[PDB]
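Sanity check record (used in CI):
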Amino acid sequence: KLSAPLDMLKQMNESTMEQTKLDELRKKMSLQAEILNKAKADNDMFFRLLIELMSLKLQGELFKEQLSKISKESGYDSAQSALIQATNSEGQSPLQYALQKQDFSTAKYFLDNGAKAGPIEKAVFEIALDSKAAKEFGFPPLPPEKEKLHPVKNFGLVLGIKTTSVDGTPSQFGHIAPTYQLMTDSVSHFAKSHPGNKNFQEIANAFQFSNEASAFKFSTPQRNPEAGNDLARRIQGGELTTIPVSCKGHAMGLSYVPDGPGSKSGYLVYTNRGLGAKSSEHGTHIFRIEDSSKITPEFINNMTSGHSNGASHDEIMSQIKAAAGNKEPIHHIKQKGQKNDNCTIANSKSNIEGILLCQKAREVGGFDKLTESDMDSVKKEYKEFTKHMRVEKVNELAKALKENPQPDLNNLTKEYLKQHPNAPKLKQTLE
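Expected output for ANK_REP_REGION domain-containing protein:
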């Protein structure tokens, strides 16, 4: 009980593996399952039975026995073989699901039964460690050197690279502080390059205002009740306002587009292209607000603290819908799904395309008045913002690959030239 925090930290470290070695482990054990030829594995049944066991809140010896039972029920020859191979429909391993749910007891039982911690599982752990549930479990605050965005996350979350560093850092999971800073700086930079774009000077005032009022450290907002009084106040005044929004282990997108200054009506733009959304729903949903005043300081505070306070995906969504008046959205911008990422850049960024669309509907006098010429205008504006990100990241990469010609080398070669044939690419001179 007093030894569990340190014990579990040690076990994550003992069970750490590199992605390829864990993939060999999975392959090895899938070959092993063909020798016994038993019931083929059924992952969806394993997780169904898994999520039911965890709610019983049983203790170790009990849990290991039921874990074995439901493993064998699901076509796995052992609990260890389930924990190593099973993934759910969102692509989570059981360890990674336990940690994302901030369920540290069940995560340690998984560790006691052979679950392995690959990079993903460790980068979900690290997001999970900055939360109240982690504090009540006995975990310390996170080391302060984990506060700079790793080069592998900086270039990978923007360009689309899905690699890993030599130190084991994934390119795919990020804290809300460094990634919100980077979305904010990347919008001010675009506004400053296009100073007649009246849309993006307002988008930049919203991002600058909310990055300053939220005051995120790692993934916890620091100025806790005030940030919501301050964001609600800017919405009641009729200004564009991004609301940082999250739940346990996952970042969404949320902003408010006013009809105009002093006006009390407008639009709520929600974005989720990852965990929590049913595929058909991937992208951005626009709700018409006729009484902004359901967007309360308490709603705003709950949004910004969802991950920290342990809020589930469904708890946050119920709130976003009641602040929109329990009405259905009036539009859905279908956007690409994103798995194995908390979507700290992806859901922020795609939300901007629904801002543009609200600023175009606003200036046209409503969504029912948009022409198809307006949609292509919106998509061109958006795609011009994104192409500005990609170019400035590539130019950042090439230049940096060269203030140091020895992870940066992988970052360029890997995915950007190996999963992106669609693109003026810059070389890697050898020294």
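The longest strand covers residues 266-272. If this sentence no longer matches the regenerated tokens, the check is flagged for review.
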